[PDB]
């Protein structure tokens, strides 16, 4: 296994795990406030970014790695709906850009499987900022009273 | 053969179908990556409306032995908001409507009855159309734009 | 979204535009002609160029670009089964040209869900390409009027 | 009760009903009797087709009180070979068009909706026929006789 | 909501946090070597420990706290399978020992709620310890190439 | 169709041809010495490079290009388990270097339905090579007659 | 365990199973690129039944503790067209069958019994085959080449 690629897969790892942690905790603060269709959206975000994660450990192990599950960076934190979901946004635009250059030393090292996975949770991540940027549009579009009467009930 | 201006009718037609075609879909994924659901929905399937009407002009077309073009384009209109894009399509629409009832006019004129009971039925669907685009721009006045868009968001 | 990669996309969805028309006028003219298993097959070809425009629109709305649906290019009409075929290859073989130098693009800027995108109806136009010279060759190998028996019927 | 002129329309209508319905039986028949089961199952339905038109013809007739006419039997067009046969139905068809735009024309004159409307849907199903009828000529030109009448030996 | 209450309830979700990701690699390492009887059970170990630290951070934020996802202490990764077994024990004896003093906390500031939560995690944490426990003992009895032949398949 | 894509097509498909027999005559010595679990495995093993060697047949077919059936390789036929073991993964090495050598032209040349098809390829052998690694693991930490015993029973 | 001329003969006729599973398995691409696809499903079924001898082959040298080689492949009878094809089929079976032949004498001589019964199996299985190939070799003479070309296009 290339080390350059295997410290490229423990980054994107490192990535999904924030992300884990906190569209978790914005799950359940939306929860907390009665906003139950975001919590449950936003639930979902946190498994999917569960599942990459699992599968990047599962290639790190296969290329006898050492994955890397004790560094957690920063959780981005908002403190109400709209914060929350341009914080989710920073975090996406941040994994993105962290998946175009792992990607990039894939292709150099003809390490092509890994590249094919690391390309699916792009167009993942890529799925979410859709998500993301219709939702802060949303609340240009109707204001921000009507998006959170809208997000109520699930 | 066909009476020549009845199949000159039939092909402007097919070209006003045309449009609505083009112009219904891209209204309706620009409503969905706006997150409008069920505005993007119901101009899909307005969009899949206009592309079996145009199905059913071409096959008539070649019956009667004419040559249908699906080469020339007119204009799109597209608008850059909700309330636009209503209106765009309303607008197309009562273009339609009217090139329709000189379509009928003549096959009457030349006694192509089953020619004008095609048209007739095309006609009754512009018509549906229009009485949705009327009702929606007369909800935006009821409600007010933010209202209509939010209860649009959903499907 | 990168701007010549938008440029690239509107230009294969010009291509999917031209096929759409071209397709479905083929198939009504084979079914006119009670060629009914051409017809049958043509307008399966059409539909299938309708859900490639689709995604193609879909990714231009995302990346923040213009889907053109305004620019309807020469459609390739033949006079008889024989040339109609002809003329969807001709189609086809500009259409694939058109879709490796958009890739090439999309590779070079990294926009990599984009290149998977292209990729995919890439595949579809070969498969398009494939069924044509195995119709041309079968008029070759049968004769033209065997051919057209063998299609008579759905 | 009717307008006289429309139920001298409505029977020469059934007259030529009357025709196609002993015409198409026959060539069904003698396609049969060949081994072109294709062609004679076919053509066998275009005889129960024109019998369901003759059926309606003579219902409304009696509603507006005048006489249908099953007596008077015009000219058969036999064909003693595939094509001429296909011709023959096609030669019936082109006069029977002709007359049922003649009758909705008296119709719309007299203000006979219900009747124009009958007439209406008769003419497209014959238009339906002439489309089947050229439709094959066309093949027997474009694959031969030969590989058309082989490709309507089997159901 | 009693503000050491809601340390103690943010230390026991600390070490919840711990548990999963331990739990989750030490899965994935069997699965590696092939032990996937050992690498099953281990992976529902580390959802039973998420399921726990999301009842946890609902309980929190009722008693308006800040659930804390972002401190994320050491991971006991062992390098084969009796160390990780090990490793485990040695995590939920400590996790055990916080879980006894939340609970003495709760019961004093008659919090009967927390407490019952608290317990419930207990049980399921001394559950966990029988089956480890059991599982040294058997590398004891059986031996231990015995004990990872049966634990090769599902 | 481009001429070293082709000849990188046969390259592979020769070594799908050896594996082929390869893993066939493996399965069925597996089998008669009543190491059932083994024989299975690498039955399907067989079948499924039987499947790659059909697809790559297809496409060169599809490339006017010329499958080559009839040059067969060396078989590496191994004499006891983990000899046979060890020669299906020297086998695999060896394929997984060509695939990458096969891969890069492909890009080369702006073949990239071929290089999709061949990606495809190289993800299933990087499997069999996470199959092999796994039970040479196993071997070294069971010893190799548990390793047997536990492969007796399908 | 094994007469080691029988183990010889099983290996023999091995081989030729290894050349028809590759000739057939290649035919029947060809024939699917060239869109005819009922010969090209025909013959696909060819070659998974040759597998099928193959293995029953393998299985039977190792129980004998003989070694089975599937390192030999001989020469591949690939055509280039239809007719070539089935003819290198029917070369390729009549070389097998006379092998077979050769096979079950030697294993009646030495008493293998079981081996002589797993070889006729096969031996009936390709005189089958025989039999299909000398009535498509037979039917391009009945019809002409481009009628049984055509009668295998659709599967
Ligand atoms: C921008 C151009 C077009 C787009 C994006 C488009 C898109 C689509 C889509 C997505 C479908 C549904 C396919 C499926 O999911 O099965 C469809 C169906 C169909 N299209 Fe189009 N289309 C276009 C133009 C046309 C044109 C120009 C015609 C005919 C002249 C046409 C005729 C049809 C017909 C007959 C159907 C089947 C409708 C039904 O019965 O449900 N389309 N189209
Ligand atoms: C005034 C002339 C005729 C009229 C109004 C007439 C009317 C009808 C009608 C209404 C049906 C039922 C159609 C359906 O609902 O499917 C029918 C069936 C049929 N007709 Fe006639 N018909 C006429 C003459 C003939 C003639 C001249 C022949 C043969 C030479 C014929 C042969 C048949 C046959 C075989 C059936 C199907 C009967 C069964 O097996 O159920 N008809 N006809
Ligand atoms: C704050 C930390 C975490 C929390 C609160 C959490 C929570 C959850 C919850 C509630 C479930 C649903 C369990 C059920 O009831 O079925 C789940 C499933 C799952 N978790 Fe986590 N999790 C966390 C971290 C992780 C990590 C770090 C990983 C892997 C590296 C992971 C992997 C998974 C997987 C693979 C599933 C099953 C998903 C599926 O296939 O549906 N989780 N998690
Ligand atoms: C020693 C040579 C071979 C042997 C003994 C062998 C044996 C077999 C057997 C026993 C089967 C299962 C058949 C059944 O029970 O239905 C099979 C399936 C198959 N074989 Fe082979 N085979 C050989 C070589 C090949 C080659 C060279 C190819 C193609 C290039 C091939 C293509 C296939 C395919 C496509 C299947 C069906 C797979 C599926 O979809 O399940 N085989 N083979
Ligand atoms: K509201
Ligand atoms: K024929």
Same mark, same amino acid.
């Given at each position: =296994? %290339?080390?350059?690629?295997? $410290?490229?897969?423990? @980054?994107?790892?490192?990535?999904? /795990?924030?992300? +884990?942690?906190?569209?978790? !905790? ?7 406030? =009665? /906003?139950?269709?975001? =919590? ?6 946190? +498994? ?5 994660? %699992? @599968?990047? +450990?599962?290639? +790190? /192990? ?6 890397? *599950? $004790? %560094?957690?960076?920063?959780? *981005?934190? =908002?403190?109400?709906? $709209?914060?929350?979901? $341009?914080?989710? /946004? ?8 962290? *998946? ?19 390309? %699916? ?19 240009? @579009?109707?204001? !921000? ?10």
């Amino acid at each position: =296994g %290339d080390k350059k690629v295997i $410290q490229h897969l423990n @980054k994107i790892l490192g990535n999904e /795990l924030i992300a +884990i942690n906190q569209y978790f !905790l914005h799950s359940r603060m939306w929860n907390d406030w =009665g /906003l139950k269709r975001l =919590g449950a959206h936003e639930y979902h975000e946190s +498994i999917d970014e569960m599942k990459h994660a %699992d @599968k990047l +450990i599962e290639r +790190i /192990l296969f290329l006898e790695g050492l994955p890397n *599950l $004790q %560094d957690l960076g920063k959780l *981005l934190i =908002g403190e109400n709906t $709209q914060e929350m979901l $341009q914080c989710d /946004l920073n975090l996406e635009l941040k994994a993105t850009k962290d *998946l175009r250059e792992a990607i990039v030393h894939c292709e150099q090292v003809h390490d092509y499987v890994s590249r094919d996975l690391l390309k %699916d949770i792009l167009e993942s991540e890529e799925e979410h900022i859709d998500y993301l940027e219709t939702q802060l549009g949303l609340i240009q @579009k109707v204001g !921000l009273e009507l998006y959170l009467q809208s997000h109520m009930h699930e």
